[PDB]
Design an enzyme around this catalytic site. Structure first.
Site, PDB file in Angstrom:
ATOM      1  CE  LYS A 279       3.895   4.624  -0.219  1.00  0.00           C
ATOM      2  NZ  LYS A 279       4.344   3.243  -0.485  1.00  0.00           N
TER       3      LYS A 279
ATOM      4  CD  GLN B  24       1.582   1.237  -1.768  1.00  0.00           C
ATOM      5  OE1 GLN B  24       2.394   2.032  -2.279  1.00  0.00           O
ATOM      6  NE2 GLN B  24       1.387   1.141  -0.444  1.00  0.00           N
TER       7      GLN B  24
ATOM      8  CG  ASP C 228       9.115   0.713  -1.899  1.00  0.00           C
ATOM      9  OD1 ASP C 228       9.053   1.630  -1.047  1.00  0.00           O
ATOM     10  OD2 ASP C 228       8.146   0.344  -2.601  1.00  0.00           O
TER      11      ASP C 228
HETATM   12  N1  LIG Z   1       2.602  -1.576   1.143  1.00  0.00           N
HETATM   13  C1  LIG Z   1       3.798  -0.987   0.539  1.00  0.00           C
HETATM   14  N2  LIG Z   1       4.242  -1.255  -0.754  1.00  0.00           N
HETATM   15  C2  LIG Z   1       5.445  -0.631  -1.233  1.00  0.00           C
HETATM   16  N3  LIG Z   1       6.194   0.235  -0.464  1.00  0.00           N
HETATM   17  C3  LIG Z   1       5.704   0.480   0.826  1.00  0.00           C
HETATM   18  O1  LIG Z   1       6.334   1.310   1.758  1.00  0.00           O
HETATM   19  C4  LIG Z   1       4.515  -0.135   1.299  1.00  0.00           C
HETATM   20  N4  LIG Z   1       4.126   0.184   2.661  1.00  0.00           N
HETATM   21  C5  LIG Z   1       3.639   1.528   2.961  1.00  0.00           C
HETATM   22  O2  LIG Z   1       3.522   2.347   2.097  1.00  0.00           O
HETATM   23  N5  LIG Z   1       3.302   1.829   4.315  1.00  0.00           N
HETATM   24  C6  LIG Z   1       2.747   3.104   4.650  1.00  0.00           C
HETATM   25  C7  LIG Z   1       2.009   3.119   5.752  1.00  0.00           C
HETATM   26  C8  LIG Z   1       1.340   4.419   6.209  1.00  0.00           C
HETATM   27  C9  LIG Z   1       1.473   5.502   5.466  1.00  0.00           C
HETATM   28  C10 LIG Z   1       0.747   6.743   5.971  1.00  0.00           C
HETATM   29  O3  LIG Z   1       0.493   7.663   5.228  1.00  0.00           O
HETATM   30  N6  LIG Z   1       0.343   6.695   7.379  1.00  0.00           N
HETATM   31  C11 LIG Z   1      -0.300   7.871   7.890  1.00  0.00           C
HETATM   32  C12 LIG Z   1      -1.796   7.891   7.686  1.00  0.00           C
HETATM   33  C13 LIG Z   1      -2.431   6.511   7.675  1.00  0.00           C
HETATM   34  C14 LIG Z   1      -3.876   6.852   7.222  1.00  0.00           C
HETATM   35  O4  LIG Z   1      -4.291   8.085   7.320  1.00  0.00           O
HETATM   36  O5  LIG Z   1      -4.639   5.928   6.772  1.00  0.00           O
HETATM   37  C15 LIG Z   1      -0.034   7.921   9.385  1.00  0.00           C
HETATM   38  O6  LIG Z   1       0.041   6.833  10.048  1.00  0.00           O
HETATM   39  O7  LIG Z   1       0.100   9.084   9.904  1.00  0.00           O
HETATM   40  C16 LIG Z   1       2.314   5.513   4.177  1.00  0.00           C
HETATM   41  C17 LIG Z   1       2.894   4.366   3.794  1.00  0.00           C
END
Ligand SMILES: Nc1ncnc(O)c1NC(=O)Nc1ccc(C(=O)N[C@@H](CCC(=O)O)C(=O)O)cc1
Ligand SMILES: Cn1c(N[C@H]2CC[C@H](O)CC2)nc2c1c(=O)n(Cc1ccc(Cl)c(Cl)c1)c(=O)n2C
Ligand SMILES: Cn1c(N[C@H]2CC[C@H](O)CC2)nc2c1c(=O)n(Cc1ccc(Cl)c(Cl)c1)c(=O)n2C
Ligand SMILES: Nc1ncnc(O)c1NC(=O)Nc1ccc(C(=O)N[C@@H](CCC(=O)O)C(=O)O)cc1
Lengths: 283, 284
Positions: free
Chosen positions: A53, A97, A120
């Protein structure tokens, strides 16, 4: 052969649109947008994602900080930090988060963030506004799933959507948007509960023009469950590799579209959070 | 043939619970619960429905007033009236009977009711609390359909529920409750759109262990669409000079395992659950 949608590519493009919208907003003589992410504890996945992020905030010209706090923080302390951030006019966007520690009430934390800064869309009034189509900010992952469908031009009116939810928080918002009148979507929607056995789930997924798996179960979705040419969106992270709920190689043979893991919904989630943040920055 | 759930009798025990709750609550020397309902215009169905609600309030020990304003009331004057009631400490429950005249925005009116007094749960905050399992008060008709199912003892966990909504306002809250974790029934739920071909709906209802029709089109549900022993719950209210639901009552009464009549089915449940929300509101 099913066509593969690069989430990473589609999200990179969306960031460029956000990039230019921020530079125009700033060139016109407004403050640079600032996003604050609060990280509690040391979940490695949560670190990975929060890193993603702030990376993206940098790419699109948005100042960012990750305020990391020890897992032993108290609920009262976390509330004072959010209160500090709510009152700082330099901070436009604020997300905590998840998941939080067991001694912090997650509902009370998300409701403590200013609704104007709630990038969010987790504050209860922003949930209500989304259910009622009075919103300006959608949660980033459900919105990201919509952008995949929309930017790809996958038709939704009247079509059958099945969503396989691990939780209500995870599958219902996707369904919410895909069912709403024309972001509309105008679809018949099924939301599968994780207490429906895969045998029954197949009875629904085979009727579906779009199947969206958000269950966090490896190989939950395979070719026998899908109808010819249907679209399959994979929202699950499952962990030494990282895969989705779909049998990618299997269903790549019969699907019409498919998203990969990683590089599918996850980049889109980070992209949509940037759109929300510049929206917040314009009040 | 199918068991026919009596909404009248289910509501009767629910109302009896509310009278007991209210009187024990007044027995501790608390203010008697009060409900105000605002009625705009002369819609005959709406006056009928508000009357049912004030009757139920009387018999369960809840004081009530209906304030009838003419249709030509302005949105501003209606907001003034809502403001007065929000501030009156005697008023525990406030609801605005819908629909409203075209010149008034129902969305601003519903967000103008104090969320503490919002016994319909239509205010934007209370919609979010119900989505997020954070609520005190549930929308009466979805909660009523739930209590039918739960009090009749129809199993839901992991079973297939299909909801036929006329609008998202209608079928989504019903689906939301049945799909929630254990109210909340751990069920798989399909929400048909009004933009759905009857045979595509058929493909989903055949699989359904619980069909809940709230579309407002008669004979939408016929026996050829149910599977044996499924529960059919009729939320529609149609005129055809007779009042009927969305199901073919006679035909589905053979194949179905459970069925609700119209009238005397979901309707009385809606009125009953609103009494529960009112004692809840009074207690804060
Ligand atoms: N928990 C939370 N609390 C507050 N607000 C939120 O939104 C969340 N939830 C997330 O943030 N979900 C999320 C899942 C995956 C990625 C991501 O970067 N995925 C990549 C690489 C995965 C890796 O490389 O490990 C991919 O799948 O390509 C980013 C955010
Ligand atoms: C708390 N939360 C989460 N958290 C967890 C983070 C950890 C993951 O492992 C699993 C998801 N994800 C959410 C929400 C949320 O509140 N909302 C708002 C919302 C909107 C409409 C409706 Cl109907 C409902 Cl129920 C809820 C969402 O949309 N999503 C995607
Ligand atoms: C305005 N409104 C209405 N109007 C009815 C429509 C049919 C007409 O004949 C009579 C007026 N019915 C509602 C709501 C509402 O706001 N809510 C709150 C809510 C909760 C969860 C979700 Cl997900 C959503 Cl979308 C909405 C409900 O639950 N119901 C049943
Ligand atoms: N419009 C609204 N605005 C604000 N909040 C609301 O909840 C609503 N919606 C209702 O209030 N819905 C409702 C519908 C039917 C009955 C009812 O008593 N039905 C009887 C008799 C049938 C008849 O006499 O027509 C039956 O079916 O047995 C009660 C409430």
């Amino acid at each position: 052969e099913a066509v593969v949608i690069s989430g990473r590519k589609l999200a990179q493009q969306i960031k460029q649109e956000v990039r230019q919208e921020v530079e125009e907003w700033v060139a016109s003589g407004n403050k640079r947008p600032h996003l604050s992410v609060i990280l509690v504890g040391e979940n490695p996945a949560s670190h990975s994602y929060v890193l993603n992020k702030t990376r993206a905030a940098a790419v699109v010209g948005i100042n960012s900080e990750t305020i990391m706090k020890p897992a032993s923080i108290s609920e009262e302390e976390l509330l004072n930090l959010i209160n500090k951030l709510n009152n700082d006019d330099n901070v436009d966007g604020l997300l905590v988060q998840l998941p939080l520690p067991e001694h912090i009430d997650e509902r009370r934390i998300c409701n403590a963030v200013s609704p104007d800064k709630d990038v969010d869309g987790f504050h209860v009034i922003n949930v209500g506004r989304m259910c009622l189509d009075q919103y300006s900010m959608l949660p980033a992952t459900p919105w990201g799933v919509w952008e995949i469908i929309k930017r790809t031009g996958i038709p939704t009116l009247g079509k059958n959507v099945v969503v396989a939810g691990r939780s209500k928080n995870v599958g219902m918002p996707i369904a919410m948007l895909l069912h709403t009148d024309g972001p509309g979507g105008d679809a018949t929607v099924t939301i599968s509960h994780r207490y429906t056995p895969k045998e029954q789930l197949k009875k629904h997924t085979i009727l579906a023009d779009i199947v969206i798996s958000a269950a966090g179960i490896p190989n939950l979705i395979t070719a026998d469950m899908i109808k010819e040419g249907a679209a399959v969106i994979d929202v699950g992270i499952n962990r030494p590799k990282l895969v989705g709920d779909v049998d990618f190689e299997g269903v790549r043979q019969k699907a019409g579209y498919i998203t990969p893991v990683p590089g599918g919904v996850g980049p889109m989630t980070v992209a949509m959070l940037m759109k929300n943040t510049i929206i917040a920055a314009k009040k």
